[PDB]
Design an enzyme around this catalytic site. Structure first.
Site, PDB file in Angstrom:
ATOM      1  N   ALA A  16      81.267 -78.120  17.849  1.00 19.30           N
ATOM      2  CA  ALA A  16      81.914 -78.968  18.646  1.00 19.30           C
ATOM      3  C   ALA A  16      81.196 -79.621  19.433  1.00 19.30           C
ATOM      4  O   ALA A  16      80.966 -80.602  19.699  1.00 19.30           O
ATOM      5  CB  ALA A  16      83.264 -78.171  19.116  1.00 19.30           C
ATOM      6  N   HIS A  43      77.710 -68.969  17.087  1.00 22.27           N
ATOM      7  CA  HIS A  43      78.709 -68.230  16.264  1.00 22.27           C
ATOM      8  C   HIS A  43      79.227 -69.089  14.993  1.00 22.27           C
ATOM      9  O   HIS A  43      79.479 -68.509  13.989  1.00 22.27           O
ATOM     10  CB  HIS A  43      80.094 -67.515  17.044  1.00 22.27           C
ATOM     11  CG  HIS A  43      80.793 -66.624  16.155  1.00 22.27           C
ATOM     12  ND1 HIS A  43      80.257 -65.575  15.543  1.00 22.27           N
ATOM     13  CD2 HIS A  43      81.946 -66.761  15.700  1.00 22.27           C
ATOM     14  CE1 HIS A  43      81.007 -64.784  15.111  1.00 22.27           C
ATOM     15  NE2 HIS A  43      82.020 -65.473  15.351  1.00 22.27           N
ATOM     16  N   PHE A 141      91.830 -70.431  -0.183  1.00 22.62           N
ATOM     17  CA  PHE A 141      91.503 -69.688   1.144  1.00 22.62           C
ATOM     18  C   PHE A 141      92.654 -70.436   2.270  1.00 22.62           C
ATOM     19  O   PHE A 141      92.797 -71.312   2.324  1.00 22.62           O
ATOM     20  CB  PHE A 141      90.317 -70.061   1.504  1.00 22.62           C
ATOM     21  CG  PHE A 141      89.562 -69.572   2.827  1.00 22.62           C
ATOM     22  CD1 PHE A 141      89.207 -68.190   2.824  1.00 22.62           C
ATOM     23  CD2 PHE A 141      89.504 -70.274   3.847  1.00 22.62           C
ATOM     24  CE1 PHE A 141      88.875 -67.645   3.873  1.00 22.62           C
ATOM     25  CE2 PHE A 141      89.104 -69.660   5.027  1.00 22.62           C
ATOM     26  CZ  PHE A 141      88.634 -68.298   4.916  1.00 22.62           C
ATOM     27  N   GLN A 255      94.063 -64.518  17.305  1.00 20.85           N
ATOM     28  CA  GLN A 255      94.239 -63.952  15.980  1.00 20.85           C
ATOM     29  C   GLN A 255      93.277 -62.768  15.768  1.00 20.85           C
ATOM     30  O   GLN A 255      91.994 -62.924  15.879  1.00 20.85           O
ATOM     31  CB  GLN A 255      93.944 -65.166  15.263  1.00 20.85           C
ATOM     32  CG  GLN A 255      94.717 -64.992  13.819  1.00 20.85           C
ATOM     33  CD  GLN A 255      94.337 -66.218  12.840  1.00 20.85           C
ATOM     34  OE1 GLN A 255      93.247 -66.549  12.628  1.00 20.85           O
ATOM     35  NE2 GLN A 255      95.388 -66.966  12.650  1.00 20.85           N
ATOM     36  N   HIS A 257      91.613 -60.289  12.384  1.00 21.56           N
ATOM     37  CA  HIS A 257      91.208 -60.703  10.811  1.00 21.56           C
ATOM     38  C   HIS A 257      91.475 -58.975  10.339  1.00 21.56           C
ATOM     39  O   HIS A 257      90.999 -58.095  10.897  1.00 21.56           O
ATOM     40  CB  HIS A 257      89.818 -60.798  10.696  1.00 21.56           C
ATOM     41  CG  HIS A 257      89.354 -60.880   9.329  1.00 21.56           C
ATOM     42  ND1 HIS A 257      89.031 -62.117   8.534  1.00 21.56           N
ATOM     43  CD2 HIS A 257      89.207 -59.906   8.430  1.00 21.56           C
ATOM     44  CE1 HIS A 257      88.873 -61.897   7.289  1.00 21.56           C
ATOM     45  NE2 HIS A 257      88.992 -60.353   7.293  1.00 21.56           N
ATOM     46  N   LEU A 267      82.124 -58.898   9.452  1.00 17.45           N
ATOM     47  CA  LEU A 267      83.026 -59.498   8.427  1.00 17.45           C
ATOM     48  C   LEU A 267      82.847 -59.299   6.863  1.00 17.45           C
ATOM     49  O   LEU A 267      81.801 -59.488   6.216  1.00 17.45           O
ATOM     50  CB  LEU A 267      83.447 -60.984   8.715  1.00 17.45           C
ATOM     51  CG  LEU A 267      84.893 -61.488   8.325  1.00 17.45           C
ATOM     52  CD1 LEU A 267      85.839 -60.320   8.804  1.00 17.45           C
ATOM     53  CD2 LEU A 267      85.195 -62.680   9.010  1.00 17.45           C
ATOM     54  N   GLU A 270      87.577 -62.808   2.887  1.00 14.58           N
ATOM     55  CA  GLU A 270      88.772 -62.662   2.509  1.00 14.58           C
ATOM     56  C   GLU A 270      88.986 -62.739   1.062  1.00 14.58           C
ATOM     57  O   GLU A 270      89.729 -62.152   0.326  1.00 14.58           O
ATOM     58  CB  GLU A 270      89.742 -64.005   3.081  1.00 14.58           C
ATOM     59  CG  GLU A 270      91.040 -64.144   2.504  1.00 14.58           C
ATOM     60  CD  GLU A 270      91.803 -65.541   2.869  1.00 14.58           C
ATOM     61  OE1 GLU A 270      92.145 -65.609   4.199  1.00 14.58           O
ATOM     62  OE2 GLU A 270      92.112 -66.321   2.140  1.00 14.58           O
ATOM     63  N   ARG A 301      97.576 -63.018   5.567  1.00 12.77           N
ATOM     64  CA  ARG A 301      96.725 -62.007   6.587  1.00 12.77           C
ATOM     65  C   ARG A 301      97.350 -61.591   7.639  1.00 12.77           C
ATOM     66  O   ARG A 301      97.170 -60.356   8.168  1.00 12.77           O
ATOM     67  CB  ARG A 301      95.439 -62.893   6.972  1.00 12.77           C
ATOM     68  CG  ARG A 301      94.583 -63.592   5.638  1.00 12.77           C
ATOM     69  CD  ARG A 301      93.396 -63.300   5.777  1.00 12.77           C
ATOM     70  NE  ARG A 301      92.841 -62.165   5.185  1.00 12.77           N
ATOM     71  CZ  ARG A 301      91.695 -61.749   4.910  1.00 12.77           C
ATOM     72  NH1 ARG A 301      90.584 -62.482   5.058  1.00 12.77           N
ATOM     73  NH2 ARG A 301      91.521 -60.502   4.431  1.00 12.77           N
ATOM     74  N   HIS A 369      89.405 -61.919  16.019  1.00 14.54           N
ATOM     75  CA  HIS A 369      88.785 -62.837  15.205  1.00 14.54           C
ATOM     76  C   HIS A 369      88.650 -64.446  15.844  1.00 14.54           C
ATOM     77  O   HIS A 369      87.412 -65.052  15.804  1.00 14.54           O
ATOM     78  CB  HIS A 369      89.278 -62.934  13.957  1.00 14.54           C
ATOM     79  CG  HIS A 369      88.391 -63.807  12.648  1.00 14.54           C
ATOM     80  ND1 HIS A 369      86.981 -63.584  12.445  1.00 14.54           N
ATOM     81  CD2 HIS A 369      88.870 -64.817  12.135  1.00 14.54           C
ATOM     82  CE1 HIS A 369      86.708 -64.551  11.814  1.00 14.54           C
ATOM     83  NE2 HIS A 369      87.876 -65.181  11.535  1.00 14.54           N
ATOM     84  N   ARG A 404      96.295 -69.730  13.811  1.00 13.25           N
ATOM     85  CA  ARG A 404      95.051 -70.869  13.399  1.00 13.25           C
ATOM     86  C   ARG A 404      95.230 -70.601  11.890  1.00 13.25           C
ATOM     87  O   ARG A 404      95.162 -69.544  11.469  1.00 13.25           O
ATOM     88  CB  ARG A 404      94.136 -70.872  14.060  1.00 13.25           C
ATOM     89  CG  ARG A 404      92.897 -70.836  13.001  1.00 13.25           C
ATOM     90  CD  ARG A 404      92.278 -69.543  12.568  1.00 13.25           C
ATOM     91  NE  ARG A 404      91.078 -69.638  11.789  1.00 13.25           N
ATOM     92  CZ  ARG A 404      90.445 -68.849  11.036  1.00 13.25           C
ATOM     93  NH1 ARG A 404      91.026 -67.811  10.865  1.00 13.25           N
ATOM     94  NH2 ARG A 404      89.316 -69.167  10.625  1.00 13.25           N
TER      95      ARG A 404
END
Ligand code: FAD
Ligand code: FAD
Ligand code: NA
Ligand code: NA
Lengths: 655, 655
Positions: A16, A43, A141, A255, A257, A267, A270, A301, A369, A404
């Site tokens: 961003a 990240h 996904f 949120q 995971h 991680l 998924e 999820r 997450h 999200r």
């Protein structure tokens, strides 16, 4: 006094921040990007799932468009998002992918032919026609019916970040790393920059600008268990909060995971469960089918995480010196499949878990997450503090609401970078600022005094013991399942932790390159952020999206169809001030209803929702009967804004 | 937009600017020194005569003190100086020498014994006692009875400049060369910095600061014949003038040197005639004795210059393709003396004149040398434009009036650097500024537009032909002898030259490293400076110090006991605006009288002068009878101010 000027100041070097910097620099605005670390280590680089965008190139993407992506986003948010913002997003995502492709991002491409694919409803064969060959591919996904997640093999975030960072270097953007913004400079309700601490030399510098943009990422490290890098501590969030004017939105919306590696938090994509990964308990028992006969492991999820915690609470968790966890069995997919489609996950379990996934099971547990909450902005990305903008995970532009969509966050970072970048550029070019040295000196001297007091403190508290206790409190009381009693306990302890953080004493007295001093000022900041999360959770008496109150299991569209706004107007107060921004159903293209995932009829209906719904069905029918296109219908339901440069439509295969 | 901030901005890297930078930097103020060239190449480096300071170390300096130095300065100025400033100067000069000695300046030292010296009234032997051994020496220079000119062999300016420049490097002062200030940033009567052009890249940058100090040297290059470096063009003077608020003082007060090498202008130290150098005409005739039977060759430098021009006008000058000149014969001193005491002058005549002084005569002609005029300031060094300070030759602090003492100018540069440095530092630390980007942008954009117009001009005028004509006009009409008729002609032609400078066209279009573009904006600036000099000369109907009006041969203490103040309030006007600041005889420690050099009774006495004189004699007698020291008497006659740090008295050999 040391002062550095630029027309556009960007705090945060992730997707961003870097993308916004490109926007300002390309129009002649001198811009600086401040970052704790080299920008390519942000990240954002860890994203492996992919980026959601309605290209409609592949067979499983056929027919996809802005409307379908829009609906998945709104329903996914459990109606907590600003739908106009969600519209700005979905319409721009396709162009973000395409611009990145032009910048060299090696998106995986479609090749003609048949493919052995897993649909988990008909694991059959998929065929890609010749006219689709060479176009950007997409994968399953985020649980969306339409496969629209674009990726560059198994390192999407990485290649995306590198491209944008390289564009900044191309344009001459000034990248200044190992630099930390510790306070925002403001006067008369306007932001003129930030007080910055050089992590290497210890110098306190004032960076002044006509506009300042915060893109500092999420605040996941306030939790003990998180997938986030160690730098995602929310200090960017805190400095906005400490101005006493800017507000934070839905900080309680966090949120989790379901399958991060335990206890590291590293991680495990998924794709594991999507391919056929099996969740097992202490007895090796495949338990998901017991709770979700139909969906099973392939449930939302959101649902998997809840079931996992429920199963553990029933006493079926695996005991460990680090806590209780469950197992993820992917061996069942066959060593061949794993080393050809999940070669990445295999390396993770070996390099860290020290186990071969094709043979042994991986320990997993749901962990924090993504941070939906963040600095509250209008649709342009500007906060209540004029001249302060925010984009990416650090913001609450609010296209995510209380949940999200998988693949929408790296997408938002770049898209917001583009859109907020335009508005930010416009602000910096047209605004005129009055820089008073008296004010600059006050802020700079104030922080130099602060650094000195920390170094001279005779306090006896240990900063690490305080930080570690904060993280346990967050994990134990502000996780997947929450209840008033525990949340009240959490708030009280966090407040006590905050007071004690002021009595910290450090061993190393130097002002330069001092990691201990860094913790001394960061921890108190993290505690105020944690307080906004915990208190927001306690006060929100309903269950919405990722926020689950066991004592208030229903979504309350009557009393809680709003957004939590946190502020800290008085530096003396020890608890955040909370206010609420109501969501106007009249401005919704899609009236509140069933989110799609989870139990049905689990929401208290708002009479206004029903009224609006009828109004929508009517407008659609009439215009639809008059032979009107989806674009004209959309405008009639909920008109939204977009910078001129991105007003164009997205050409697709088949138009 | 490019902006650079510092607490203290210094424009000019000569003795004055560098010393002032030390003053601000040593107290924690971030300071920047801007300079056209590497600072150690500033004109200050060319000083070979020495620095005047009342140490009283040597035999010929015995008994010297502040009072004697003060009187030589005031009388030398022909009463045009601010006596309070002159007092600040003489009391501080001794400490400037001593501080420089501590900084390593290799001042020539006294050794015990007898020495063959030329007194030119008794060329006998001088004896230095044992208690004087190892102390800082002094030589005969500037025509003062007391020998107080300190020197480092034959390169005083050089060693002094290097020491101060090295101190700036020690302290971390930011030295930025090949950078030219082309305009001052101001608003509401306050100075906030300067618009700067990077000579290498062509970038236009705004340097903002809480205080700005101009120490840009003299404006001698507006003349064709000058001893000044090619960079002494007075642009620093012009940018102050172009603010329309700051005023220039006594611009018509220009000092000439009698024996510069012709036509180069390369200086042949005063020591030549002081040792026994002989001035000869076209017939080899020693003419000085004809005009000055008593003083002869050793008359006041002021008188020698006049006699030289008179002799030339009588048709006794030597014809040359570069103009008329006279001869300087130093061979008569003997080859031995020349190669041991004037080895430097010998090298000059060889390296440039291509002649051996011990054999052939050197061509000489009086040429512009020092600029008494400059930016008008109060005793603290601050101009009418608040926040703008000035020191060194670029200023009119006015310790020189209409005739600077030989050896007082390099002394002033360092002393003002120290004193104005303190007041400047105080201002920068205590003042608070309001920096409006709207204002910064206006000035920066205004200069970028100006640079563009010069590069795009289709004008047909040649900048060099215009600059060269300006220099001839100045030499022909504003030299040693001036008259109303010629001055009126000069003003009119300069004004016409100014108008034509606006129609200049250049061949090279690039914005970077463009010497032609540099002339395009500097010349118009030089013309406005020249206009202030010429017009000030025309309007000043009297003869005072170095300003000689043949049509007004007398010093008028009734109508002209004042200071000319030039300004340019309206950018449309083509002639400077002149006003006058009257000198109050009541605030004079020494009432106007005979200056010592030149014809007697050549001044129109002011009744107030006589009154004040009586008042002075009275106060002295009474206090003197009451057994009061020279210090208490001085305070009673004219109290003056000094920064606390320099309030102490100067210990001398013998106290
Ligand atoms: C953690 C994570 C997230 C993630 C993911 C996998 C992992 C392990 N996979 C994703 C996926 O497949 N698809 C998707 O849509 N999202 C996925 N995510 C989440 C996503 O990656 C993030 O939301 C996104 O990358 C956030 O980008 P953003 O540009 O907002 O932020 P960032 O990359 O974290 O960078 C923050 C920058 O801020 C600097 N910083 C922070 N604080 C300061 C202060 N005080 N001063 C100066 N600089 C500061 C950081 O250094 C950094 O550069
Ligand atoms: C010319 C000369 C003068 C002189 C002398 C011998 C010669 C050949 N011998 C002297 C002596 O023996 N005793 C004495 O007392 N004085 C003597 N003088 C005069 C004396 O040297 C000067 O008055 C003195 O050195 C002046 O010092 P000052 O610090 O004021 O100035 P400077 O050394 O000339 O340096 C000016 C600086 O300004 C920079 N500059 C100029 N314009 C600009 C702009 N527009 N922007 C940025 N920088 C600028 C120059 O680059 C320089 O560094
Ligand atoms: Na967020
Ligand atoms: Na001067």
């Amino acid at each position: 006094m040391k002062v550095q000027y630029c027309d556009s100041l960007v705090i945060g070097g992730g997707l961003a921040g870097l993308r916004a910097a490109v926007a300002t620099q390309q129009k002649g605005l001198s811009t600086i990007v401040l970052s704790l670390i080299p920008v390519k280590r942000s990240h954002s680089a860890a994203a492996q799932g992919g980026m959601q965008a309605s290209l409609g190139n592949s067979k499983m993407s056929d027919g996809d468009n802005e409307d379908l992506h829009f609906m998945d986003t709104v329903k996914g948010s459990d109606w907590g998002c600003d739908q106009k913002v969600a519209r700005m997003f979905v319409n721009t995502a396709p162009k973000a992918i395409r611009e990145l492709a032009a910048w060299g991002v090696p998106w995986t491409r479609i090749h003609k032919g048949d493919r052995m694919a897993i649909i988990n409803a008909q694991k059959t064969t998929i065929t890609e026609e010749d006219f689709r060959h060479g176009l950007i591919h997409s994968r399953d996904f985020g649980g969306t019916k339409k496969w629209r997640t674009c990726y560059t093999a198994d390192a999407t975030g990485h290649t995306m970040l590198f491209a944008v960072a390289n564009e900044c270097l191309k344009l001459g953007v000034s990248i200044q790393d190992r630099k930390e913004a510790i306070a925002l400079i403001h006067q008369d309700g306007k932001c003129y920059g930030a007080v910055v601490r050089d992590l290497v030399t210890g110098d306190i510098i004032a960076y002044v600008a006509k506009g300042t943009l915060i893109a500092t990422g999420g605040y996941g490290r306030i939790y003990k268990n998180t997938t986030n890098a160690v730098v995602c501590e929310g200090t960017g969030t805190a400095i906005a909060l400490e101005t006493g004017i800017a507000q934070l939105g839905n900080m309680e919306a966090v949120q989790f995971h379901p399958t991060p590696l335990f206890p590291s938090g590293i991680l495990l994509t998924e794709g594991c469960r999507g391919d056929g990964g099996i969740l097992r308990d202490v007895d090796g028992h495949r338990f998901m089918p017991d709770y979700e006969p139909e969906k099973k492991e392939l449930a939302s999820r959101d649902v998997v995480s809840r079931r996992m915690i429920e199963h553990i609470r029933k006493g079926k968790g695996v005991q460990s010196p680090y806590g209780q966890h469950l197992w993820l069995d992917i061996s069942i997919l066959g060593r061949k499949h794993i080393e050809t489609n999940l070669r990445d996950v295999q390396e993770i379990c070996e390099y860290f878990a020290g186990i071969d996934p094709a043979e042994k099971w991986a320990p997993v547990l749901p962990m924090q997450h993504y941070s939906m909450g963040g600095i509250r902005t209008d649709y342009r990305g500007e906060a209540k503090l004029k001249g302060l903008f925010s984009a990416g995970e650090a913001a609450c532009w609010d296209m995510h609401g209380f949940n999200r969509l998988g693949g929408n966050s790296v997408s938002e970072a770049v898209v917001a970078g583009m859109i907020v970048g335009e508005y930010f550029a416009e602000h910096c070019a047209n605004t005129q600022v009055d820089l008073e040295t008296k004010t600059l000196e006050k802020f700079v001297k104030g922080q130099e005094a602060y650094m000195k007091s920390l170094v001279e403190s005779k306090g006896t508290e240990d900063v690490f013991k305080i930080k570690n206790r904060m993280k346990d409190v967050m994990d134990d009381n502000v996780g997947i399942f929450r209840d008033g009693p525990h949340l009240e306990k959490a708030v009280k302890e966090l407040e006590e932790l905050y007071k004690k953080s002021k009595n910290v004493g450090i061993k190393n007295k130097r002002l330069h390159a001092n990691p201990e001093l860094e913790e001394a000022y960061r921890v108190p900041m993290m505690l105020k952020v944690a307080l906004c999360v915990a208190k927001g959770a306690l006060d929100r008496t309903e269950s919405r999206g990722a926020h689950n109150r066991e004592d208030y299991p229903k979504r309350d569209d009557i009393n809680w169809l709003n957004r939590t706004l946190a502020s800290w107007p008085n530096p003396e107060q020890t608890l955040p001030t909370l206010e609420y921004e109501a969501l106007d159903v009249n401005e919704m293209e899609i009236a509140p209803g069933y989110r799609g995932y989870g139990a049905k009829g689990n929401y208290i209906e708002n009479p206004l929702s029903v009224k609006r719904q009828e109004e929508i069905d009517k407008i659609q029918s009439e215009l639809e009967a008059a032979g009107k296109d989806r674009h004209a219908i959309q405008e009639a339901l909920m008109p939204y804004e977009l910078p001129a440069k991105y007003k164009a439509r997205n050409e697709r295969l088949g138009d």
